[PDB]
Design a protein around this ligand. Structure first.
Ligand code: SF4
Ligand code: SF4
Ligand code: SF4
Ligand code: FES
Ligand code: FES
Lengths: 241, 164, 239, 688, 59
């Protein structure tokens, strides 16, 4: 169950002693960077975004792979090469989450042209996250994917603080009703309002991690959700009359 | 800059209370009680001047001495009088004239207000200073970082390390 | 929380009760004591998770109330903290399960690869759903979150409790079709050892994929790190 | 100083605050009562309710004022649109799963959640899904648990871990399925276990004896004091008509803070049983209902029929100072000098108040880093005092005990168990002396059971020797303290309610009186109450003394009158009448004055203020209500002046320094008549 | 308001204000400007119409 900042782990960490927590990848590259030089490390990437990165590519990819590549490489280059492209071709691509599961996803328009960078995906209202690639095609139910992500987050929330603990189930039920179309147009804005409610109001960032994917889902595919909502009337309102 | 609940009618009640001529009125002991016209035995009983303490059931602090200048919070009470029950229904029966008039109406901003009220009315009164709340915390858990400082079990001893 | 554990409070049973009897083995006690040495004595409570895990293999794949009491008395801590930790973590099972524990990832990257197809095949063959156990006490099915094998999704991890702590095995099975998982289960049933990891490649190196969750389609493309490994090198630290 | 009081701004208001204070505390000093759910004054900072979110300049996120430290130059905003938006969203997140139990919830009318929702919340809900259903838990017969109402504010866990020290409750499960309670079926063994319901801001934890009885607004609140022990906790009495419904603690930092013993919490039920309402005089058929005139005449005839040396008066645990002094004047005016106290050590000399009080005071005790216990069990003598001792323990204060090793909910050092161990400690034979001799502010506390020893002078002499050797009493400090377990003892000591030397000698050769009067006494020894002797009892509960009595006067209970009661530190406190007299009962000192007039020697006072003024003339400090004087100290001159009492009845080195309190849940008739204490006793007996 | 249940935008009750204005002593009341805005003929006379209903705020 996480603590609150302030205080910091460096000020007070494990057993009240100074402590710095680091990622495996950041630690591992250090001797190579020390041995081969910060100048050599800075030779790659754009400004403030130097170096290489390990990339995990999954989804509907012809050649899923965990590969090392230079930063700032375009998604299209990073996927068509070293991963065999999209199953069914690039034109069959629907959406891609470029930074794992906590960052907003990007549609085909945004993805084609954008690079894998911290300061490039951020301005696209997304994030590099863990630089993990998930690829979805046109035969995929994007709503089901986001609902399953929300269910995962609901099961993964620790429940220490009120907003996340009580809103994960609410978000899951909202998404589940959206999946069957048993929802209304204004309830989409209601969902966005709830996401704004949770975001930045909890103890840790897990609330943001759960709120962000649905935010981007709505922002980039609100047409799909409304189409589903109306379409349920063709299979639910026929008995109401 | 002056800002003490400066967005309400209370300011209009702050003034018209300090009107010159109207703010210099004074009456002697038991004098106002003569004007009451109530039976004379009303002044024979004792009264309690105090502010009720905060209830343990709630963390609310509005009806407490904390917001003293905001709301009149001094109460005058009387000793409870003989009470019994109705033989036919069981409802509580009493004959007190001064049963509830204080706990429902008599409210005062300061203790001196009730002191003057009793003096001009002739009610013999007791003053009970309410206990002051303490805001300073304890040495343990003084700050949020104290929950996770080294005071819990002392500094970690580096004796179980490999090679000791 | 996980499957087969609908209660966060104790429930009385002839198998699991206040009268339950448990004691560590000498090898288990030695292993736990060695684990104890990883933390300072004034912070002896920090080793509760590995001790709980080791007790879980020792009992046969789940933790009883008496086991929690004995662990608490070993670590000199209140039983309430032990109960909290046991109910806090997914791997810790508080109810009796089968000899083998089957766990399936349900996360979306695994779902897109045909996870529901593998689940349906397991349901149709083993005859039980999630949270259920075979009548013979052989296979226990459970659902899990992302297991960090998404490039080889879909994947399944099966835990073995037939050989105790020293013979405990946690094997990943990846790049699976219904045929693959069914044959893995059959090989386990007959007494063989199914091969670990992917069923069509070694590791996360570029290879084909599972198309629609039913068929492996090999594909050829650019692969990296195919040359000789780089020699040791360091630059001049001076100036 | 390096500016111990830093400055910030809250809504453009400069407020001076101490260093280390929080934004919550700053806003409290700013005159704003920020909504809050998990933070408490006496607990550690939890900060999970998210209800203390505020806005600070140069900060994009709302900050946890319940946890955020204040930095110099900080700006705090509390009325911005984002503040209200966050508050409303947090309230909505609180209420989505909360069950619609307000009509059946007992906290309706005093629910912090309800008022905070009314003020800082909205009016409508957009949640239409199935809620989370939570099964209830069993913790004993004192608290009713409705777990579905729990908001997981964690206050119960922090309270149990810190104040009680039992640490028996925790958070099970995770996320939405996070659950509160004990994994196993356990009975809450905390003696201060009733404070959790008051600390519970919702109806999840409710007083089982009080459940579904009455509502908060139906009550009349009367601030009272606790008479179940010698600490005298400040409490409020809530009643509906003439019947007491519940009793709750009230704030007094110098006495009890915000805490109350469950014995002092649940013993109000006994006021409904075995109550004496009418005067009784024993006839040939036995005791029968008779008028106050008849009973008083019979009592006067019985009193005058005997010689002055054949009349004995005994004071009970719950007799007030007024009745005690009135009866003492009555018996003195007729030549009688036989006085006894139900609290024991009636023959103890009382010349200097400091010799039988707590000279460090209760709040001044918190300045001591080292505490010595000499034959006392504060857990069963004063659980609130034990909780304050634990609070002192929580920040470095070490405690030593000389006596029976018992569970005290904190680590301590057992020096010994008999006076020989005390002598060894005073001689220098134990390392604890040097720790005492090095402590800047050492403290020594002795219980009342030590004063009940026949060799009390020797024990006091040894304690004084150790205090002198360790310098426990010096300039600007006094770590010497004397505590008690009964309220009426202190007032009797201060008023000089002590038997004459002639009566002491008469007991020594075995003289037995014939007229015995009880002032609400029911735990007398057989040696002070001879069989076949006429008994005049005054009280308000039918008990052992009443049964053996021959004339009974229905007196007033502490919940029906306003009596004076001074705690063991020497602070004068008074009760308050919450409900009128029960039956034909009368004022105790009025009863004694009537008896005095009937006998033939009127008391010179005829009013409550008059008898209080008589008390003040007897001892000036009685006038100072709700205050305490600094007692004088006379060094070893007092001990050297009571050396003869030490010579006679020498020290017993074998008897352990134990606690005479063997039944915490039953000490007086009211406790002996309470159903709730009996239920708790059975529950503690059904665990085996 | 079925799904947009925010209240602060519509809390008229707790948002009214009273202010103590400045001491109105050294002010200049030009009655000239007062009487310059008044009509002088049968025409040029303007009257404030009677409001049809009290405010409803959309409901
Ligand atoms: S955001 Fe969720 S997971 Fe993170 S601390 Fe709060 S309740 Fe726990
Ligand atoms: S705790 Fe308060 S809000 Fe909850 S049901 Fe009871 S009265 Fe209603
Ligand atoms: S039971 Fe009461 S005190 Fe305990 S966490 Fe729930 S609301 Fe808070
Ligand atoms: S999505 Fe299944 S292992 Fe990561
Ligand atoms: S008091 Fe601030 S979140 Fe609990």
């Amino acid at each position: 169950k996480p603590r609150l900042k302030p205080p910091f782990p460096a000020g007070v960490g494990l057993y009240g002693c100074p402590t710095t927590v680091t990622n495996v990848e950041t630690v591992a590259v250090s001797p190579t960077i020390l041995r081969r030089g910060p100048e050599w490390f800075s030779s790659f990437g754009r400004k403030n975004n130097a170096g290489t990165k390990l990339f995990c590519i999954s989804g509907h990819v012809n050649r899923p792979v965990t590969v090392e590549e230079e930063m700032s490489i375009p998604l299209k280059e990073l996927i068509e090469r070293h991963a065999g492209g999209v199953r069914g071709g690039w034109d069959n691509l629907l959406a891609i989450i470029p930074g794992g599961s906590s960052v907003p996803l990007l549609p085909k328009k945004i993805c084609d042209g954008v690079l894998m960078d911290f300061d490039a995906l951020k301005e696209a209202q997304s994030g590099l996250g863990t630089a993990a690639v998930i690829v979805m095609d046109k035969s995929t139910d994007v709503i089901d994917a986001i609902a399953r992500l929300s269910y995962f987050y609901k099961h993964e929330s620790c429940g220490q603080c009120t907003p996340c603990r009580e809103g994960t189930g609410w978000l899951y039920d909202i998404m589940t009703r959206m999946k069957k179309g048993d929802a209304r147009l204004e309830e989409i804005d209601m969902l966005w309002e709830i996401t704004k409610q949770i975001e930045g109001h909890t103890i840790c960032a897990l609330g943001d991690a759960a709120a962000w994917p649905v935010q981007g889902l709505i922002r980039h595919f609100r047409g799909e959700m409304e189409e589903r909502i109306k379409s349920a009337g063709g299979k639910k309102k026929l008995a109401a009359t | 800059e002056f800002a003490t609940a400066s967005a309400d009618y209370s300011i209009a009640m702050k003034k018209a209370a300090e009107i010159t001529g109207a703010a210099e009125s004074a009456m002697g002991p038991k004098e106002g009680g003569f004007t009451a016209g109530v039976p004379l035995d009303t002044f024979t009983r004792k009264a309690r001047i105090y502010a009720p303490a905060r209830t343990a059931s709630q963390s609310g602090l509005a009806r407490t001495v904390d917001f003293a200048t905001t709301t009149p919070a001094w109460k005058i009470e009387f000793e409870p009088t003989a009470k019994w029950q109705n033989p036919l229904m069981g409802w509580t029966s009493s004959a007190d004239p001064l049963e509830n008039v204080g706990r429902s109406a008599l409210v005062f901003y300061t203790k001196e207000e009730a002191m003057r009220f009793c003096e001009k009315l002739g009610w013999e009164y007791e003053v009970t200073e309410p206990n002051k709340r303490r805001t300073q915390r304890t040495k343990r858990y003084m700050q949020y970082g104290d929950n996770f400082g080294t005071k819990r079990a002392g500094v970690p001893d580096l004796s179980t390390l490999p090679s000791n | 929380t996980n499957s087969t554990d609908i209660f966060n409070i104790h429930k009385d049973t002839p198998e699991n009760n206040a009268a339950t009897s448990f004691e560590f083995s000498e090898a288990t006690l030695k292993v736990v004591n060695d684990i104890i040495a990883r933390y300072p004595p004034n912070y002896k409570q920090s080793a509760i998770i590995p001790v709980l895990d080791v007790t879980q293999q020792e009992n046969g794949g789940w933790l009883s109330l008496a086991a929690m009491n004995r662990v608490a008395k070993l670590l000199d801590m209140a039983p309430i903290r032990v109960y909290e930790v046991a109910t806090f973590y997914t791997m810790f099972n508080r109810t009796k399960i089968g000899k083998y524990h089957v766990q399936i990832c349900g996360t979306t990257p695994c779902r897109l690869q045909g996870s529901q197809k593998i689940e349906e095949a397991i349901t149709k063959h083993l005859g039980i759903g999630i949270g259920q156990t075979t009548q013979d006490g052989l296979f226990t099915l459970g659902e899990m979150e992302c297991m960090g094998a998404c490039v080889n999704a879909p994947m399944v991890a099966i835990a073995d409790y037939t050989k105790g702590v020293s013979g405990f095995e946690y094997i990943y099975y990846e790049d699976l079709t219904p045929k693959d998982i069914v044959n893995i289960l059959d090989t386990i049933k007959k007494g063989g050892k199914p091969k670990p990891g992917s069923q069509y490649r070694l590791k996360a190196e570029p290879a084909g994929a599972v198309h629609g969750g039913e068929k492996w389609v090999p594909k050829d493309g650019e692969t990296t790190l195919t040359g000789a490994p780089r020699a040791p090198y360091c630059r001049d630290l001076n100036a | 100083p390096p500016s111990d009081h830093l400055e910030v701004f809250v809504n453009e208001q400069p407020v001076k605050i101490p260093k280390g204070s929080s934004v919550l505390q700053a806003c409290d000093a700013a005159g704003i009562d920020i909504p809050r759910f998990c933070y408490h004054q006496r607990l550690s900072i939890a900060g999970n309710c998210r209800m203390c979110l505020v806005e600070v300049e140069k900060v994009p996120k709302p900050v946890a004022s319940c946890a955020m430290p204040a930095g110099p130059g900080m700006k705090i905003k509390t009325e911005t649109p984002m503040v209200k938006k966050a508050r409303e969203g947090v309230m909505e997140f609180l209420l989505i799963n909360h069950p619609l139990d307000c009509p059946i919830c007992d906290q309706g009318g005093e629910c912090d959640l309800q008022d905070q929702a009314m003020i800082f919340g909205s009016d409508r809900s957009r949640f239409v899904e199935a809620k989370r259903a939570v099964e209830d838990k069993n913790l004993g017969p004192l608290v009713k648990t409705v777990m579905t109402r729990c908001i997981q504010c964690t206050r119960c866990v922090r309270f149990a871990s810190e104040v009680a020290g039992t640490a028996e409750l925790g958070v099970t499960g995770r996320g939405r399925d996070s659950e509160i309670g004990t994994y196993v079926e356990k009975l809450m063994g905390s003696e201060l276990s009733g404070n959790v319901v008051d600390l519970c801001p919702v109806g999840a934890l409710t007083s089982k004896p009080y459940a579904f009885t009455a509502r908060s607004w139906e009550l009349k609140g009367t601030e009272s004091i606790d008479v179940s022990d010698g600490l005298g906790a400040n409490i409020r009495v809530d009643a509906r008509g003439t019947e007491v419904m519940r009793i709750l603690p009230r704030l007094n930092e110098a006495v009890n803070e915000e805490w109350l013993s469950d014995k002092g919490r649940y013993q109000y039920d006994g006021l409904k049983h075995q109550r004496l309402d009418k005067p009784m005089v024993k006839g040939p058929k036995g005791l029968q209902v008779a008028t106050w005139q008849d009973a008083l005449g019979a009592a006067a005839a019985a009193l005058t029929s005997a010689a002055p040396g054949e009349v004995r008066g005994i004071a009970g645990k719950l007799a007030d100072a007024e009745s005690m002094v009135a009866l003492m004047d009555l018996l003195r005016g007729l030549g009688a000098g036989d006085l006894a106290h139900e609290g024991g050590f009636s023959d103890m000399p009382a010349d200097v108040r400091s010799t039988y009080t707590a000279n460090t005071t209760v709040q001044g005790l918190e300045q001591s880093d080292l505490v010595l216990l000499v034959g006392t069990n504060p857990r069963w003598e004063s659980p609130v005092f034990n909780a304050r001792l634990r609070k002192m323990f929580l920040d470095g204060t070490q405690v030593g005990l000389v006596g029976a090793p018992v569970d005290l909910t904190y680590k301590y050092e057992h020096v010994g168990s008999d006076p020989a161990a005390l002598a060894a400690l005073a001689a220098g034979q134990h390392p604890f002396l040097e720790r005492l001799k090095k402590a800047a502010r050492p403290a020594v506390v002795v219980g009342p059971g030590v004063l009940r020893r026949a060799d009390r002078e020797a024990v006091m002499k040894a304690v004084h020797e150790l205090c002198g050797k360790a310098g426990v009493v010096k300039e600007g400090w006094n770590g010497f303290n004397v505590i008690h377990d009964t309220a009426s003892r202190v007032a009797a000591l201060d008023m000089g309610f002590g038997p004459s030397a002639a009566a002491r000698a008469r007991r020594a050769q075995g003289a037995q009186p014939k007229v015995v009067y009880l002032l609400g006494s029911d735990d007398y020894s057989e040696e002070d109450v001879p069989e076949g002797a006429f008994v005049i009892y005054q009280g308000h509960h039918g008990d052992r003394g009443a049964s053996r009595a021959n004339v009974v006067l229905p007196g007033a209970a502490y919940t029906e009158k306003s009596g004076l009661y001074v705690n063991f530190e020497g602070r004068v406190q008074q009760t308050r009448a919450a409900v009128p007299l029960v039956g034909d009962a009368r004022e105790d000192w009025a009863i004694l004055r009537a008896l005095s007039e009937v006998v033939g020697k009127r008391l010179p006072y005829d009013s409550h203020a008059a008898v209080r003024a008589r008390l003040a003339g007897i001892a000036p400090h009685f006038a100072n209500i709700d205050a305490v004087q600094t007692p004088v100290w006379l060094n070893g001159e007092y001990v050297k002046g009571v050396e003869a009492l030490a010579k006679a009845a020498p020290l017993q080195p074998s008897a352990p320094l134990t606690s005479t309190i063997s039944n915490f849940y039953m000490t007086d008739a009211i406790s002996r008549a309470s159903r709730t204490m009996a239920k708790c006793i059975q529950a503690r007996q059904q665990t085996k | 308001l079925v799904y947009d249940i925010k209240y602060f935008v519509r809390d008229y009750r707790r948002n009214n204000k009273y202010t103590a204005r400045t001491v109105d002593a050294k002010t200049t009341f030009d009655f000239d400007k007062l009487y310059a805005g008044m009509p002088t003929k049968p025409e040029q006379v303007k009257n404030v119409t009677r409001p049809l209903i009290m405010p409803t705020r959309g409901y």
